[PDB]
Symmetry: C3
């Protein structure tokens, strides 16, 4: 009656079409010229494809919105998806729901999703997209601005295309302390951040069973680190194998260090930075050396008394300053084949050396055959 007319009006205003451009589905109805079709049973409306000739009549309309007519067939659900004409179902993944059409969206805490798999799709209460098929072609597909924001925020850059081809995640290989929220002002204690940054590269346990265990850590993927601010730390940093450290330029008699590492421990009878050398214990196991004065001898390495875990380490322009009184700057122990360029230790704080930010002993090295220090300062 008038109900049909006022509804057509409601539907039309929603899609931006004309009242006459809306047709109700019914077996045998002429589909020609109409822009939108309304299923009175499900009470859902769908844009019709352009091209239905006059005289083409309706045969059937599935609950998944598949429309069959005298001239052929068409998935109104897929068409709706392509046109971003969606219905956001009540509830959520948490409440559970049942999906019947490709253009139905279910809300999750991080945005909306459509189901690209077999329909109907039942979602049990307490669900998540991961627990109900996962994401991707044939499963759950993220839809809408809210889910785009969360995806970009929690992603790895794979949504960002780059030239000549590929995506952003393909070319981001360098790490920074900023990824770990290091303050970088040389005041705040950035120790935990620096250690996590290194641990994420090569996390080697301080105690290990045998030689095969220790040696295994020299066989991992190497990663480059870029230090562009000033990081104050308070405990000896142990560089694991497979680490490349980089800084734009090297210090040269600089009064105020602005980029690099600042060692400021409570215990000054220690080293700022050390390579990893494992020492044999009575039980037969091995423990990372933490003793400041220790250095392995060739004998120690032959006795099995020591096992180095310092390989594939490269340094470019690292600047290291220390609080006055610190015993040792860098312990280059067991670093065979390891290399350095522009390693710069100590700060030219001022005229009085007793208060200058430099160590008593700059560098201590042993068991480092084939190592090269280029332009060390």
């Amino acid at each position: 009656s008038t109900g049909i007319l006022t509804n057509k009006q409601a539907v039309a205003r929603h899609f931006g079409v004309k009242q006459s451009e809306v047709v109700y589905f019914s077996v045998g109805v002429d589909l020609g010229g109409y822009k939108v079709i309304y299923d009175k049973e499900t009470q859902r409306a769908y844009s019709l494809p352009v091209g239905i000739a006059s005289g083409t009549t309706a045969v059937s309309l599935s609950t998944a919105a598949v429309l069959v007519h005298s001239a052929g067939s068409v998935d109104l659900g897929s068409l709706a998806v392509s046109r971003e004409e969606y219905v956001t179902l009540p509830g959520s993944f948490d409440s559970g729901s049942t999906l019947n059409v490709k253009n139905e969206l279910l809300t999750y805490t991080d945005g909306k999703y459509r189901w690209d798999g077999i329909l109907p799709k039942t979602v049990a209460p307490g669900s998540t997209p991961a627990s109900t098929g996962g994401v991707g072609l044939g499963a759950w597909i993220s839809v809408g601005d809210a889910s785009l924001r969360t995806q970009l925020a929690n992603g790895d850059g794979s949504l960002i295309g780059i030239h000549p081809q590929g995506t952003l995640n393909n070319v981001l290989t360098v790490r920074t302390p900023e990824q770990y929220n290091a303050v970088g002002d040389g005041i705040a204690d950035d120790t935990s951040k620096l250690k996590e940054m290194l641990s994420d590269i090569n996390n080697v346990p301080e105690t290990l069973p045998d030689a095969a265990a220790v040696n295994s850590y020299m066989e991992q993927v190497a990663v480059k680190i870029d230090l562009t601010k000033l990081y104050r730390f308070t405990e000896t940093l142990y560089i694991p194998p497979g680490v490349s450290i980089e800084i734009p330029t090297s210090n040269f008699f600089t009064r105020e260090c602005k980029q690099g590492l600042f060692y400021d421990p409570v215990d000054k009878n220690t080293a700022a930075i050390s390579l990893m050398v494992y020492r044999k214990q009575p039980d037969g196991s091995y423990k990372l050396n933490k003793d400041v004065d220790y250095y392995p001898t060739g004998l120690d390495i032959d006795n099995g008394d020591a096992i180095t875990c310092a390989r594939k380490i490269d340094i470019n322009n690292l600047n290291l300053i220390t609080a006055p009184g610190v015993k040792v700057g860098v312990k280059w122990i067991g670093g065979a084949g390891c290399t350095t360029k522009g390693l710069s230790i100590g700060e030219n704080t001022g005229s009085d050396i007793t208060t200058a930010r430099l160590p008593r002993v700059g560098l201590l090295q042993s068991a480092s055959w084939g190592s090269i220090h280029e332009n060390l300062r």
Copy 2:
């Protein structure tokens, strides 16, 4: 208002707020209205996308724009956009598997080709020399790529890996040459050899190396310059004849180039080549800390 139809069906736009659906999202027309769109049109074939033409609108469009762009939609500090600072190339951009198992040859070759695509056959000396006057690009190798045919490095290429191998038991980053024909080189520079017709062909003979005389009488023309290597690790299947053919690389430079894997006690099954490196016609070349 999303108009009925699409770019496939064609349409006519009359208002600034009308959107026409394409396969990758919606667009409004920012030019002169009314705008007629013939059936079978695409935004690129009907004005292109930009101010005064087709303007991308909505979430679907933003997703595709971002996914197929170059980073120009992303602002960066202190100013400019992402594309302004992405200059390095990687095998991952070509979907290399990087596990040392899958054959990544085609991907690596494509990557090199996208930097400087040098034809294996050239008409003359002038043609060959031109390829040494192209923009150089840096490549970052962070995984392990197995390849099965000799890779020819064209001029204008810089290769880097975070660190260099050193008596490494198991190579984790770099190139692993695993060919069927082991009487070959893993990596080679480009040197062109004169043919009876006067044309030039890329050398692909493992034993060939140019001599000073060869260059002098035009029998050989180098196409190897502006090439720099920092920390490249190269291992090969046991029995591979030559690791690196550094031929004609005048002024070319290396640092931390590391050849061969310390696989185990039996050298017969070690993943290293019979001959590590063969070099000729490379005056002014420098190899720093070659392993």
Copy 3:
């Protein structure tokens, strides 16, 4: 008047006309998917799981709905559903 409005609101949200309820003091909220405030002339999806027998107590201009079983800020729910 009311029926055509329910139609309008239902097509906007994609629900059935009978799944739209007008707010009034005491109205039973069970089973409805959308509620309409005749005063502000605004509609809001209802949180799922409101049992039959749960009646409306009050609806503020800030869209906070108080019913016999508790309360819900329909504005916050709308935000989570990107219904603006």
